[PDB]
Amino acid sequence: MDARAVAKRPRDPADEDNELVTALKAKREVNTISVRYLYHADHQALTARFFVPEGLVEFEAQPGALLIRMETGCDSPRHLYISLYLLGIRASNVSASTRCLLESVYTASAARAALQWLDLGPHLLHRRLETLGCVKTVSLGITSLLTCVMRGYLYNTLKTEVFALMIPKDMYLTWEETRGRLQYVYLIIVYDYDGPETRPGIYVLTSSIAHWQTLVDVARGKFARERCSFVNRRITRPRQIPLCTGVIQKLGWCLADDIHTSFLVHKELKLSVVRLDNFSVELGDFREFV
Amino acid sequence: AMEANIFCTFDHKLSIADVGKLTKLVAAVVPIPQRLHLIKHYQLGLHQFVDHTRGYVRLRGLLRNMTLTLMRRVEGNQILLHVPTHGLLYTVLNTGPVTWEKGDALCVLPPLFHGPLARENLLTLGQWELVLPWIVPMPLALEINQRLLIM
Amino acid sequence: VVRCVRAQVDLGVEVRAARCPRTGLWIVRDRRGRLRRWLSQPEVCVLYVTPDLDFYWVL
Amino acid sequence: RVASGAGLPTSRQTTIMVTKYSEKSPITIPFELSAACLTYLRETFEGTI
16 A cells, blocks of 8 residues: 555565475475475476376377377266377378387277267267377376376476477478478367268378468368368268368467477387477467368 | 455345355356446346247347356355456356266257246245356257247 | 270279278279279279179279 | 216306396375465465464
8 A cells, every 4th residue: 555565576486385395384394395496386387187098198298299188978988088099099191101100009998989979979080189288298007097287388297398399290281381480389180071980181281371261261271172172072972961071179389490300219119200409388279160 | 465356246135045055056158248347137048038929049049148157156245256267267067958978079058948946946045036147068959940930 | 904095995994992980982003002083084984803703884 | 067977978167147237116106286286385464363
């Protein structure tokens, strides 16, 4: 209220002590627990923690990978937390050599069950799947307890070193010959409405385009064949209901200079990846386009 | 060290039973027509918009532009409300009829159950009945919209 | 490959064959990988035979 | 070792080295504090009793 207190400078949070420090200091005792510096206090990255069975956590022990929950009409295990690579197993976009590579590592009773639940129901994938963000730490227990982030950067505790985002080469997709200073990274599930297969194409779009109309124009321009396949399935097969030939959502934005080619190793199996070092997640809902 | 909040008051008298009923809704969502600072109790929720002739669609149209808030604390002096902001986490009550899971996209809906009910008997004053909007997962909201439109 | 304007036929043509994704029709290609383009030429005609001994005759 | 008799395959002077490792097992406890004790721990109003 006073002009001294109003024009007083704002208080540094790192200079003032914790509530526990002043609480212990008031009654003046001592505990064996060191309390004077609380960890994770200066953490803008709001995180969450997820239990998941052992059969899905391979190629995840290295930090930095997507995580997607699904829905299944069965009641008790109803939501599986599938990694992006097990999602890419199902996708028709990936090369068959890499497909037989990363299927050979994911031989588990939970992974094949998730693969059956992907293609069992009548729903398409975009009405079924739901992102969570990228993962930063593992637990590697008998069941695994991963730590994903909803918003913010990807870093180790104490912020000693930043965590990168990994994506396989086949899901990587750019639409410009040179990049801007900033570029967003998206998710694309495009639907081939073909007779024999309905397996989609999975992509990430490291593009410098933020506006949705100027993004969806280039999205239609690069995926004209898929919309032509959609309208061909519309005219050839009557009384069918096709919808959302491609879907699009925002995943984050990168530094546009640390993007480089590295590789993941799990059980001496190389898997080449595009790696984005200083990256912050930024989630959004599944918009669609036809 | 205080935070920017909204001081809502009540012109009716409040029983200790009604205060104990109100303190059950700590992390409850409340829509507010305009984020003032000293608001009365007449603009908490949707009882300003309960109409005999109007329906669900105008309630959804108003709720698209309402200023949603959260409660902080209840006192015999006054009531504390908190406006949320983007990119921060908050505790929020599941007053909706459907349980949730982790990572589910949630959105706010006008109440389907209307008027007097065994669940709508919350903070009911003389001319006032505090009503709260539902917090439903997103695909159930889409299903409710489609089914209500086709009905 | 029978070429009528030059009266020259062809006996041994090795050709790779596949199906289009959009339609069930066939696509023929060179054993290197080059697309075979004689089907546009109107004066020529071709006979295809498969390893399971089916038979096509394409004008 | 021990010296051997006649016509018997004797012993040879051998050593053996062996390591041993540490095994970690961290333990943890969560404990909660409400917003009420947080907003009442370092905050006084009117100086009332």
